[PDB]
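Subject: mismatched residue count in predicted assembly?

I count 1034 residues in my input, but I want to confirm that the predicted structure covers every chain. Input:
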Amino acid sequence: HQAISPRTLNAWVKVVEEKAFSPEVIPMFSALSEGATPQDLNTMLNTVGGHQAAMQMLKETINEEAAEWDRLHPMREPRGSDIAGTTSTLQEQIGWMTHNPPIPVGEIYKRWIILGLNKIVRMYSPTSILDIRQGPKEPFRDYVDRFYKTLRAEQASQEVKNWMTETLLVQNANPDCKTILKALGPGATLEEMMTACQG
Amino acid sequence: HQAISPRTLNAWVKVVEEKAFSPEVIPMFSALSEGATPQDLNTMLNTVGGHQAAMQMLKETINEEAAEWDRLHPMREPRGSDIAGTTSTLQEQIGWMTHNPPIPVGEIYKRWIILGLNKIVRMYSPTSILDIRQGPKEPFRDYVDRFYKTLRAEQASQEVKNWMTETLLVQNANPDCKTILKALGPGATLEEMMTACQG
Amino acid sequence: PIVQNLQGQMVHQAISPRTLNAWVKVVEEKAFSPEVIPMFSALSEGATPQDLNTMLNTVGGHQAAMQMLKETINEEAAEWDRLHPMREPRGSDIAGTTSTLQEQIGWMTHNPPIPVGEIYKRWIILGLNKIVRMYSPTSILDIRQGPKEPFRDYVDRFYKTLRAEQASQEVKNWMTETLLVQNANPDCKTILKALGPGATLEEMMTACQGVG
Amino acid sequence: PIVQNLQGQMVHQAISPRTLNAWVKVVEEKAFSPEVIPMFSALSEGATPQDLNTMLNTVGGHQAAMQMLKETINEEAAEWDRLHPMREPRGSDIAGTTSTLQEQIGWMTHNPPIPVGEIYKRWIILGLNKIVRMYSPTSILDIRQGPKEPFRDYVDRFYKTLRAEQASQEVKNWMTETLLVQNANPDCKTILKALGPGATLEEMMTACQGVG
Amino acid sequence: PIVQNLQGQMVHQAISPRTLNAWVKVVEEKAFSPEVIPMFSALSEGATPQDLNTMLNTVGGHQAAMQMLKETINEEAAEWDRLHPMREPRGSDIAGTTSTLQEQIGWMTHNPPIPVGEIYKRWIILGLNKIVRMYSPTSILDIRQGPKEPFRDYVDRFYKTLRAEQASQEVKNWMTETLLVQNANPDCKTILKALGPGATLEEMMTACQGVG
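Triage response: the counts match. Full output below for your records.
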């Protein structure tokens, strides 16, 4: 076991505080927590000082997932609160990751954390993708940026997201760009749409 | 297998954030992602915040290149989406880069990403090279710097680049410098062209 | 119609009263729209010339329509007798005025079948097309999309009038390709012209959905 | 259809004239709404490929619809011949253009039955779904409840357009769950959002009754 | 349906295409009003479980309605299997999904007849009542006579909503006795209250005729 580096922890804390909760926080967390034990994940979550509402939301989601784990799961085989790192030693957490065959308590807990952060990101997104609409004078580039950030925060299935991508982007544009996007015809691509609507 | 470092990820995120999509981001990405797996490349692309129009265009370009790989190439072998890292697992990626000969899935995906990024740079060029014109009291050093920055962004063919460096550069200069550059005559390299124009 | 007996012999089956009532409702209520011709074809499936005459008796209330229908039937009978100089069916035998029902059953049951009923049916359909074109309320050049009219409804009106007016197939293809785009309203004609030449109707309708 | 003889042998029973008239009324008057597909399925129960072709002849008045219907039928026939290289039915035999009626009766009476009629029926229903989606007046994103519109009528319009637009089942489930609530009018959308996620349509309709 | 052969043996008679078209028109055009249940009962007279499933296939276009219909059918099948632990019909045999048509004919022809078709019919009618109550536009408390509305039309609306809402018989009797008088317009409610308690509907309609 190697301790979470001070630079890595400061990086995680700074991205959380500065970025608030944007969709990129999920991949940033996943990258910064490669190989992390539940103790290290708890360190990463507790070290954050701001957004205490969201940290409570994350703790509640972790508790729900742990309760479901205990419901489905009555060296000792870990329980939900054991996987969450609150009723386990760091040595026992090193166990089940060095076990043969290892049951990765760290990654299981990380999945729960990712679910909680998805819920948090969806809540923190300013508006729904069905509500994102181009302004009368907004450039198509800016409208596309807002649309796809919101779609990234949308949390729907991938097929639904594909349908959203192909339909809502054209549907929600202002009439000046909506006519051009229709003249582009169906089956267009974002490069062609954005070059056409640069004017 | 080694995961990409937090310092490297912070550097990539920061350079994207501050440079937007100036041409040097392509070589910066190529340098920072040396030895990267498809998972590492996906981490680098997903950790970026903002520029979501550009990131979607990159996704579409990657999907197109994956389709071309599927057309050209109809344990489990790598499909286009496998080289993209969307479907394949990290163990499959490691194995494909580990065979002798290996399938360098990291480099193939990197080439696709570089194609997408070149398209993004070409679209994010703030102004066309035809509109780069020297100011009334602008130094020729600054003017030609702007001209060649734009020319790097345009990514025209070498014949058009040679023609436009020879002709449009001197056409778009102010009269005071334009007279000097015309007196120099054709065939002047950039070194001679701008050293004769100092002051 | 004609139906095999219990022991297999073919015999005439009279056209039912409610089928005749359905044809009467088509003639009276539909005002000789283009849809009377599909309904005449459907209601008279298997009909012998006697049954077709029974149906035509209901058109006699419309004097001009019956008159031009009869004149078209006579002209097609003459065209038949030009090429065709029980007995062989005369032009007036196909029309079921000089013949008897048993000859009609025999002709319909010949090997190969002499499709006397279907021949008279096609003559009657020619006459009905003439009547429908006569009663058309507007020419195809007069159909123009309204400011708020959906493209689907305008296309429906355009193709209904196209069925009524009965131009040649080349002229019909040109009309659908060009005149449909020309008469559309400006907010929609912009998209139609943007789609360019060779635009199939599916592309035109999908692109123009909700433009009103 | 096919019906047993008096002595038990199966024989073709021609599709009745008034059933064809009913299908003609569906084609002409219904304007290719989503309800033409249930009515095509109902009116063509037991139909042989010859009967299905007889019904399809009435769609020929709509030139674009008939064209795309035929193209879909040909593509499905090719898909059949890909997997299937009296005789074994060819793709054009299922379509009832190269075959004869007796082969169709035999295939429908095989042990186990070769459901040639139902296969052609499903091909035709695919083509009809394509036509219905083409003729849809509005996309599902355009259905929005009015200020005084009852929630029942708005739900009816939403689900009619949902049948017309034919998204995938996952996308349809999402649309009913989310987009239905999104497009409702504010006085009603308040209650819809108050019901929370996982609200069945019965709860949404009972809660929203009389809110207009 | 089931019909005796020429020699007396019972055999399945397929539900006709136009009867299925009539049921399709009821499902599509009637919007699940209270009158769909009498029409389902009428159109499915003598229907076997296979015929009832054939009819239910047309409701599948309405996804929520079909879903709750199936759930009600399953719950009633479970209630049947609770009391009932060729073979004896299972709950899924009454639903015509695990059984075969011949067993259904045999059960319908037993001495005494096992009314499998009518049992499934009553289950389907329960589900249809649930759907009708779901789709009811207004509650019975919202029906109020207009200033100029005749008492006959208001009574018609009141009793239509009463059929839709499906309260218990005691509550229905109270509603007809009291709530009908309460919601009437003042010029008419004066006469209604003057008639006093125990006023039959005939007295209320005769007294209130022409009061608008």
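Chain B touches chain A at residues 3-4, 6-7, 9-10, 43, 46-53, 55-57, 60, 119, 123 (CB under 8 Å). Marking this ticket as 'not a bug'.
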